[model samples]
Target chain A: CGAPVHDPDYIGGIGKELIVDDTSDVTSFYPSAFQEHLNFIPAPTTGSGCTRIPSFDMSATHCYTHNVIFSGCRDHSHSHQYLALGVLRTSATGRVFFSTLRSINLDDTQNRKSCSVSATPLGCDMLCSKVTETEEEDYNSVIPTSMVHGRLGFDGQYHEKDLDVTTLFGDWVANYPGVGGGSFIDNRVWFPVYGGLKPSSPSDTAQEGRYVIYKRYNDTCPDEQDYQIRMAKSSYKPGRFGGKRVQQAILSIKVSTSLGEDPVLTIPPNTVTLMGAEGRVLTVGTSHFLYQRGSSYFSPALLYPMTVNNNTATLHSPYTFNAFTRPGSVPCQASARCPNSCVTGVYTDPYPLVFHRNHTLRGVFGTMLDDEQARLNLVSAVFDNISRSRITRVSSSRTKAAYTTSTCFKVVKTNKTYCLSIAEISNTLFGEFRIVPLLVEILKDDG
Target chain B: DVVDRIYKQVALESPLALLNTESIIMNAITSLSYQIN
Candidate 1:
């Protein structure tokens, strides 16, 4: 017992919100999408009764281009498009791999951190703005063993997919681990996912999906529950000949990464420092997260395994697409006046959403080439299975029937807010595409 | 016809009054039934 026992009081409380203090010698933060569950909670359920609102009510004013702040930072648009779309996987890890933006750091200290090409014109902002560590923190809750997606962008309307969300969540599910939201939580979770980011962007000369970041949920978080995560065949490895498990994976490719040569991305190392103040706690974080907010990373590329085929799902590999270089590029000189254009900051990344039908077809995809935001083909899918047996639980016995669906989806960005929609994308290019089924449910509440 | 007439007359006399009566009965039944058997 003399071996420094855990201070029983260190972690104590009931429904109080626990504020995680960032006070230590930690250099980087590995955000776990698993802990993301506790970090993001749906619209408050504190009030009771069946409160109903229009699908596209006036509150739907904020578009997907807005409201994608940090984790748990969405305004709940309640739009039929958003509300109908369910989340299958959410990258539990918030690691943006970078250090590789260049080989050497010997350049002038100020220019050392800047990218050769300025992907995000705004340059950079405080990586981790909000940090609190308190026992009052309550783990986010989620429904156990059940799959459900959000309706943040859907409402029984028509789309290219077969189903809306299969199931929805209202309570805590289980315990998960991650850095941003702390570890071992019992809270309501939207999806189970895991992934990381590159410390620097690569100098790939193609204009496809560059300055990219990767996020995965549901099946992404490396399972500490067992050591076999690496040994276990990929969730996407199984296909029609195999069991149809909801395969989840995310890939971010840096296509050209050439936004006017001499581009400057003063992105600091993905660092998370914990410091304690006299009366409060302060945690600071920095990473190469620009433009794309809801889900994005910096100039990362990879080949992931998905369910479409038992083969590997390569992202930035040759089978996907190429990185496009821009025109009239030049190196930045110290005297080269840096643009002081009033750079605006968006609360969230505003790239469009894609409806990923499955895991093998990786990257952005879409059937309707005309859908404005459908450029990324951010996918949302509903499956062929909905059991009447489950809906009868936790709902109304006075209802008529039970319906449910599931989908796997993703959204990406070119740079940041202002540049997202304005950036020029070559239509002659494409990335990998696939789908990972999400879970959603439709229950009748006579109330 | 008389029964229907009487029901309609009661309904017309005070729509809210009859609804309130039904609500009270329903609430009472709900509260009582909710009691842990």
Candidate 2:
């Protein structure tokens, strides 16, 4: 009926797809990892029972590189990585749909703007392109929070309310009965989890877990309930942990749910570790994030505390940086390059890292190493704690003001508005810089 | 008497102490040595 909605083999949607103005060009432009390694199944014609797919099926690398293009009056270059994966399938009625278990990864541009390298060499393509504010528009078109990491179903979006998922695949999930011979298919996506036992092989058995739906209720009708297409595993119980898992959540994806703000998917990182007999502690931290998605900043108030025990050092759920809350407007001039005078103090700069004594900081900086695409590159970590001897604590602040002041000393003929050092700030402090974690403790009573 | 007078004049300072003295004193001693030479 109605040409079977979409081609059973095409993962991208077919003709006249909603929001996707051009269906002919809908294609995957990610690297070889997504193209060659992934075991993409042909879109199913009929399926009542749920079928599952592991991230490894899509890409063994788990790291897909793509370019984000800014096309309007001014053209700029940017790139990001696709860090999560799941499966795509057709409903019993023949509507094609795909669901990602966790958030998709994108490069955070608040710290630094635009790509430093040539887009032509990275072999950048249109597969993963996110549009920023253009010269014609005075307001920001994209939300910093939505793209903080990524939202399931929706990759980033063109408009504030419209989901990017809709742009890519159209309303196939909606399944309009008028055009297609639609069946009453609840295309409600969710996370399939296997917590009781460790899979013999993640590729073969990771998708065999049970599904958990989001918890939501409509306020108007007390008993009436609604579940959005977005969902995640409620909790991850590792085999060894008994009472409650420490840091069970590896990463968290936050957004405004249909039921308001209650349920958000928090997925676990890929790997974890155990401490040695020497009572050494394990430490973990994530890259800094800024929230500037819409009119208001959707900042999550929680610290991603790294947990470690004598028996284990596991990665907990990931968290986002509550970068700043500001009015919606472009920070700098449209054509101006970054580190310009206007955006100096407009964005957040402090990179927060928490640590303790006898704790070994390792393995957490893996994602932040995307040097070509990442906004801020972490160069070195300076932990002043030295075996309980006299601890030398140094607090350093690298800001626009500090950089401009220092640049004056280095250069002559300094005009009052000389922001020459502004561009140099990222070079000196942002990219491949040192992380000096000073020992600061919070008293339990203080909380 | 001469030895006592010399000890008092030198203030019982050791050769190492004299060597460890300020640069001004070293400069004066060098100037005297050069004059005698």
Each prediction's DockQ? 0.01, 0.00
Q: Candidate 1's residue-wise lDDT over A1-447, tens digit each?
A: 011111122112111111122231111111111111221112222222111110110000111100111123222222111121111111326221111110111111111000011111111000100112111121121221221111111121211111111121111121111111100011111111211111121311111121211222221333343432221222111121122111112111111112111111111111110000000000011001111101111111111211111111212211111110001111111111111111111111111111122212222111111111113222111111110011111111211110111111111221110001111112222101111111221111221
Scored by lDDT, the top model is: 2
Q: Where does candidate 1 stray beyond 4 Å?
A: A1-148, A152-307, A310-447, B1-37
Give per-residue CA lDDT, model 2, range A208-295, as digits (tens). Answer: 3432221111112122222211112212222223311112111111223331112122223423211000000111122212111111
Which CAPRI tier for candidate 2?
incorrect
Predict model 2's lDDT versus the native. 0.20
Task: State the weakest 10-residue window (summed lDDT) of model 1 chain A.
Answer: A273-282
lDDT at position A328, candidate 1: 11
Candidate 2 positional error at A265, Å: 6.9
